[PDB]
Design a protein around this ligand. Sequence first.
Ligand SMILES: [Ca+2]
Lengths: 99, 8, 278
Amino acid sequence: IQKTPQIQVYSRHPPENGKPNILNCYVTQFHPPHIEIQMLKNGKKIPKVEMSDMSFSKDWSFYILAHTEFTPTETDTYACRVKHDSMAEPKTVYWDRDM
Amino acid sequence: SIINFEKL
Amino acid sequence: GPHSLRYFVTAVSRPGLGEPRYMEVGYVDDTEFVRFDSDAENPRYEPRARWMEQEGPEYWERETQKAKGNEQSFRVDLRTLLGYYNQSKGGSHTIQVISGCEVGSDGRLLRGYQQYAYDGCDYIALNEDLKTWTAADMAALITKHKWEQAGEAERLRAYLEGTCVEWLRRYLKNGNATLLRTDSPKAHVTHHSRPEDKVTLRCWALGFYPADITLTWQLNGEELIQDMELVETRPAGDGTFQKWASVVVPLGKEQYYTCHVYHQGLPEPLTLRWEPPP
Ligand SMILES: [Ca+2]
């Protein structure tokens, strides 16, 4: 039995163009615990991405928080990409500063 | 202090 | 009280790629205070809250040796389960356990628990009576019968009602009042376009702890139980949490809607509206 990850991408603080911030990728509801998480800026892998320890929920599913420093601009695009065996292909989720 | 687990 | 002492255990096999990865993670009142991670050359129980540094070398030694004992017992269980389930020897599998005690303000056990899952599904659980087992499937019946025969429930009750409770007390003398930590949400409403004559009002709550919170939108005094969109509460990464709830409303009617934020940290619930800049 496999559980498909849910994903949220969002800033630690309300974004302000030109202001240093933190971009989070919160991944939950997955099983098995092996997972591969990338964050992307304008289509290219961000090299320095940190990971919380992995934990699990009452329903046994695992969750983890990936995060990276970033300074949003009006036009830069950010995403989080997740590869997990419950999914045929990696799932990508774009940052939306309104969400 | 966690318990000592017994075999399944 | 109340207080809680919880342990989350994970054992993951990876045939051909190393020994199983084993982890014990302990929480005093939902805050991690200890951790054993087998994925190291000289693995040791380590304090995960600075207050736990109060504990002397004798504690960490004992806890470490118990952890390594547990780890090797789980190594065995993983093989046992392949048999029970007629599974190949080549695949990765996981055992998880949740074990602990919730203790009331009077220092008595409110609830004790001991539940297992194999590959993310219920396997077996000690019932609330601290006397019987619930087996989730045919393989779990084997474990159940073995544990009934050996009086495993009685061993667990003794741990849950005594040891677990007594340790929780001792940990608290070192790090309590910390667990009472509360951070109140700060809220604001943002405004966003929609096609035609509709707009979106998004009520944000930021910087709160613990994660439990409720956001509601009201039109003229009645909660909008329908068409309210929200996100699952999420970590900011600094120990606090975020959430938002939004509603689509008619352009020009923004001042008819009110957002309410309920959180244990607040003196009273917050009430706010879209505040357009002058
Ligand atoms: Ca959760």
